[model samples]
Target: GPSFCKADEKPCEYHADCCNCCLSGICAPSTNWILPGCSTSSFFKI
Candidate 1:
């Protein structure tokens, strides 16, 4: 692993860190939209 986060990490690995979740796997920033990890429904509760 590079041990550094990037703007996009599709098919993201387990330890891969991302700037944002890049929410949708289907659309390439294609109207699925971007969201903060905390604000989205899928993120863990920290």
Candidate 2:
């Protein structure tokens, strides 16, 4: 499962750091929309 991250709760340098995506150095809330540069594969092993 994706890592738990609240909106602007944690600071991040990239989208892979957040369950959804990072915005302005903070973790973004999970949304239906998938942001570019963020991938589920980053959170899971193949």
Candidate 3:
């Protein structure tokens, strides 16, 4: 199990922190791509 919340517990602080998706997942919400956590139909690309 991985604790991702506290500064130390969190896998990474910024995008650079997360080199591999396994190490830490980033929440990069592009124009067409959005994290599932953000919500359904929240992101759209056109």
Candidate 4:
């Protein structure tokens, strides 16, 4: 049967949650997440 799951999905309430600033899946404090904000046109870059 087909499965309905995002599998290992992160706890992202906003666009910033799902993105990594270093492209390493970990957003650093000094460095802002490279991904666009939720309201931005390219919300989901991956």
Candidate 4 CA-lDDT value: 0.36
What does candidate 1's lDDT look like per residue over 1-46, in tens digits? 7445545536334322354434345112222345433343546766
Better of 1 and 3 by TM-score: 1
Q: Which residue pairs in candidate 4 collide?
A: none
Cα deviation of 12, candidate 1, in Å: 1.4
Candidate 4, 5: how far from true, in Å? 21
Better of 3 and 4 by lDDT: 4
User: All candidates' lDDT scores?
Assistant: 0.40, 0.59, 0.35, 0.36
- Pull out the clashing pairs in model 3: none
lDDT of 3 by residue, 1-25 (tens): 6744333223554432322221255
Off by over 4 Å in 2: 1-8, 32-46
27: Cα error in model 1, Å: 10
Any idea how many clashes model 3 has? 0
TM-scores, all models, native as reference? 0.24, 0.38, 0.18, 0.21
- Relative to the unseen true structure, what is the C-alpha lDDT of residue 7 in candidate 1, on a scale of 0 to 100? 59
lDDT of 2 at 33: 62
Give candidate 3 regions above 4 Å deviation.
1-10, 20-46
Ten contiguous residues with the weakest lDDT in model 4:
21-30
- Per-candidate alpha-carbon RMSD to the true structure: 7.1, 4.9, 11.8, 10.5
- What's the CA RMSD of model 4 in angstroms? 10.5
Q: Which stretches of candidate 4 lie over 4 Å from their true place?
A: 1-8, 20-46
